[PDB]
Amino acid sequence: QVQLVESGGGLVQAGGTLKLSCAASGSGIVVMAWYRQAPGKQRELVASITSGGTTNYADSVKGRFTISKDNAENTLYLRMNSLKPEDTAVYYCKAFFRRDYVGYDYWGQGTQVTVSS
Questions:
Q1: What is the distance between the terminal CA atoms of the chain, rounded to a whole angstrom?
Q2: 71, CA 20 to 30 Å: which among 16, 24, 30, 31?
Q3: 10 Å Cβ neighbour count for 35?
Q4: Which residues contact 78 (CB under 8 A, 6 or more apart)?
Q5: Cα separation, 109 vs 90, whole angstroms
Q6: Pick the CATH number of 1-117 from 3.40.640.10, 2.60.40.10, 3.50.50.60, 3.30.450.20
Q7: Which residues of 54-79 are buried (b: 16+ CB within 10 A; e: fewer)?
Q8: CB 108 within 8 A of CB 94
C-alpha cells in the first residue's frame, strides 16, 4: 500500500488483451481493487479482491476481466480480454488497510488504456 506502481497499459485494437500490474513497495491489508476513470467521467470500480480471495466485478467487465493477487510478488493484476473502445480510461489500483483501528486508502498513479475501433 505505502507505494503502489502501475504498469501494463497501452494502445490496443478492439478485441485485444492487456494485463495491468499494480506493484506494492512491499508488504493490515483488507482489500485491493481496480478502478477506472474515462475522460470527464467519475472514477468507477472495476474489480476488487479481499485478502481472503473474494472477487467482485462491475457488470460492464464481468467475464472479460479477471483480478488476481500474487502475495509472493506483492503484485495485484487485472487481466483484460475482449477489450472494447468503452474500456478506454486511466486505470487505478487501490489498497485499503487498517493501522491502529483506522482505515486508510493508498492509490497508484494510474495507467492509460486506450482501445481503438
A1: 35
A2: 16
A3: 20
A4: 8, 19, 20, 22, 34, 46, 47, 65, 66, 67, 91, 93
A5: 9
A6: 2.60.40.10
A7: eeebeeebeeebbbebeeeeebbbbe
A8: yes
* Domain chopping of the chain, boundaries: 1-117
Residue 55 to residue 67: CA distance in whole angstroms:
7
Record the resolution, in angstroms: 1.5
CA dist 17 and 84 (Å) reads 10
Rounded CA separation 16/115 (Å): 8
Residue entry with cell 472479460: 64
Number of residues in the chain = 117
Strand 10-13 relative to strand 111-116: parallel, antiparallel, unpaired?
parallel
* CA 71/CA 69 separation, integer angstroms: 6
